[PDB]
């Protein structure tokens, strides 16, 4: 098994 | 198995 | 097997 | 097992 | 603008 | 604008 | 098990 | 601009 | 178990 | 501008 | 068990 | 500009 | 400029 | 236990 | 410029 | 200039 990449991406735009 | 990429992408737009 | 890409994409638009 | 990369990315834009 | 995800995925099988 | 996902996917099979 | 990299990344832009 | 994720993913399977 | 790298990265931009 | 994440991921599987 | 590296990185830009 | 994260990830599996 | 994080991650699994 | 490294890094840039 | 973090992480697993 | 942090991390697991 060649490993793992996990990404949680949650940009928030205000005003 | 050549590895793995997982992405959770949840942009939120407010006002 | 050449690995894997998994994406969950859930944009939310508010007000 | 080829290790693991985990990223939480939450940019915030204000005013 | 809720950001961007860009992915280049080029699996190679040899021999 | 709910962001953007862009993927370039080019698997190669040799020999 | 080849270890682990964990990143929490939260840039803040104000005014 | 809500930031950016860029990924280059090039798994190689040999012999 | 090949150890562990943990990073908290929170850059802040003012004025 | 909410920063940037760049990843180069190149697992190699041998014998 | 190969230990641990923990980093808290919080650069501040003013004026 | 909210900084930058760069990762080079190259797991190797042998025998 | 909000600084920089650079990581080179190369786990090696043998025998 | 292979020990521990902990780093708190907070550069502040003024004028 | 808010400084810099550079990490070279190379865990090795034997026998 | 906000300085620099450089880390070389090479844990070795045997028997």
Swiss-Prot record, chains A, B, C, D, E, F, G, H, I, J, K, L, M, N, O, P:
Annotated domain remarks: The tau/MAP repeat binds to tubulin. Type I isoforms contain 3 repeats while type II isoforms contain 4 repeats.
Record-annotated site: Not glycated: 10
Binding partners and assembly: Interacts with MARK1, MARK2, MARK3 and MARK4. Interacts with PSMC2 through SQSTM1. Interacts with SQSTM1 when polyubiquitinated. Interacts with FKBP4. Binds to CSNK1D. Interacts with SGK1. Interacts with PIN1. Interacts with LRRK2. Interacts with LRP1, leading to endocytosis; this interaction is reduced in the presence of LRPAP1/RAP.
Location(s), subcellular: Cytoplasm, Cytosol; Cell membrane; Cytoplasm, Cytoskeleton; Cell projection, Axon
Sites of Phosphoserine modification: 4
Transmembrane segments: none
Organism listed in the record: Homo sapiens (Human)
Free-text description of this protein's post-translational modifications in UniProt: Phosphorylation at serine and threonine residues in S-P or T-P motifs by proline-directed protein kinases (PDPK1, CDK1, CDK5, GSK3, MAPK) (only 2-3 sites per protein in interphase, seven-fold increase in mitosis, and in the form associated with paired helical filaments (PHF-tau)), and at serine residues in K-X-G-S motifs by MAP/microtubule affinity-regulating kinase (MARK1, MARK2, MARK3 or MARK4), causing detachment from microtubules, and their disassembly. Phosphorylation decreases with age. Polyubiquitinated. Requires functional TRAF6 and may provoke SQSTM1-dependent degradation by the proteasome. PHF-tau can be modified by three different forms of polyubiquitination. 'Lys-48'-linked polyubiquitination is the major form, 'Lys-6'-linked and 'Lys-11'-linked polyubiquitination also occur.
Covalent cross-link (Glycyl lysine isopeptide (Lys-Gly) (interchain with G-Cter in ubiquitin)), residues: 10
Residue(s) carrying N6-acetyllysine: 10
Identification of the protein by name: Microtubule-associated protein tau
UniProt function note: Promotes microtubule assembly and stability, and might be involved in the establishment and maintenance of neuronal polarity. The C-terminus binds axonal microtubules while the N-terminus binds neural plasma membrane components, suggesting that tau functions as a linker protein between both. Axonal polarity is predetermined by TAU/MAPT localization (in the neuronal cell) in the domain of the cell body defined by the centrosome. The short isoforms allow plasticity of the cytoskeleton whereas the longer isoforms may preferentially play a role in its stabilization.
Modified residues (N6,N6-dimethyllysine): 10
Tissue: Expressed in neurons. Isoform PNS-tau is expressed in the peripheral nervous system while the others are expressed in the central nervous system.
Residues shown, of full length: 619 to 633 of 758
Pathological association: In Alzheimer disease, the neuronal cytoskeleton in the brain is progressively disrupted and replaced by tangles of paired helical filaments (PHF) and straight filaments, mainly composed of hyperphosphorylated forms of TAU (PHF-TAU or AD P-TAU). O-GlcNAcylation is greatly reduced in Alzheimer disease brain cerebral cortex leading to an increase in TAU/MAPT phosphorylations. Frontotemporal dementia 1: A form of dementia characterized by pathologic finding of frontotemporal lobar degeneration, presenile dementia with behavioral changes, deterioration of cognitive capacities and loss of memory. In some cases, parkinsonian symptoms are prominent. Neuropathological changes include frontotemporal atrophy often associated with atrophy of the basal ganglia, substantia nigra, amygdala. In most cases, protein tau deposits are found in glial cells and/or neurons.
Gene name per UniProt: MAPT
């Amino acid at each position: 098994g060649g490993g793992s990449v996990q990404i949680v991406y949650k940009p928030v735009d205000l005003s």
